[PDB]
């Protein structure tokens, strides 16, 4: 997490980096299979190490509040 920042940057900066990245690094449940093997490949790119499915998602999360609204509509 944010610990690599030492006593630099301040509270809000690094609290939001740990938060974004903790969610960022969470086991994600893949769209194709149902397995929780989705990891970020880069900015907005996600893949599942299990079947290798490579997806377009949020920048720090595979799904964004807006991406879900689409499914419905």
């Amino acid at each position: 997490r944010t610990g690599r920042f030492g006593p630099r940057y301040g509270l809000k900066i690094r609290v939001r980096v740990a938060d974004v990245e903790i969610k960022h690094k969470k086991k994600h449940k893949c769209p194709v299979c149902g397995f929780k093997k989705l990891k970020r490949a880069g900015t907005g790119i996600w893949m599942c190490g299990h079947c290798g499915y490579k997806i377009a998602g949020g920048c720090y999360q595979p799904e964004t509040v807006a991406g879900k609204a689409v499914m419905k509509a």
């Binding site: 980096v17 907005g44 997806i55 377009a56 720090y60 964004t64």
Partner: protein, 237 residues
Amino acid sequence: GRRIQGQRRGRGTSTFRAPSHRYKADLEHRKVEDGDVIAGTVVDIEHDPARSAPVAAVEFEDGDRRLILAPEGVGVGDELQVGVDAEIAPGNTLPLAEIPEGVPVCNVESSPGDGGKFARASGVNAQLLTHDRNVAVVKLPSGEMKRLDPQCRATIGVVGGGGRTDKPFVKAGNKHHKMKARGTKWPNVRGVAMNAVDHPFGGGGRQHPGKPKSISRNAPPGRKVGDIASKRTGRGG
């Protein structure tokens, strides 16, 4: 005095240009004779150095291989379709007319065939509200209600990479690297930090602007700095 920095920009020298040669593709919708038959498959997902957002590589039936402004939720294997009779799923492109109202769209054309102009940045999206035989009313991310020829094509879904703006750069170092991939001079020195000769706000024994910051729309380049034709400033009221 000397030309201010905003005038230096205009000259288009190395320092202000965009590292174009390092860019991948000019994301634009495909041209289709008609019929809509055109479909293709998602061969891969890449990073767009020009938009800090993901982009999809696609292989069309007629052999054509082109990168595509990738909406959220497109993966490798998926089949996208472009045409009047395109199915109505995320990733597919078709004129606003064939699109059902109430649906989120991105990479909208300003005039049919231009290849898409509106809503293309990370996680944004337009909102198709009203239909008609003559006008298609779309709500662009800025919130403006834009009237468009129902023939302007567009992509279903919201642009991928959403939420990029949520996390702070944290350190100069990170801005640095981002900036180097854009047509932008960075960092930024404050006008009031410069010398009278370099900027209308420069000079003085302390740092403050000479006159008020709101400048007239009619101000000539060289003078037009600060708050441009501001309709109001501050937060009060």
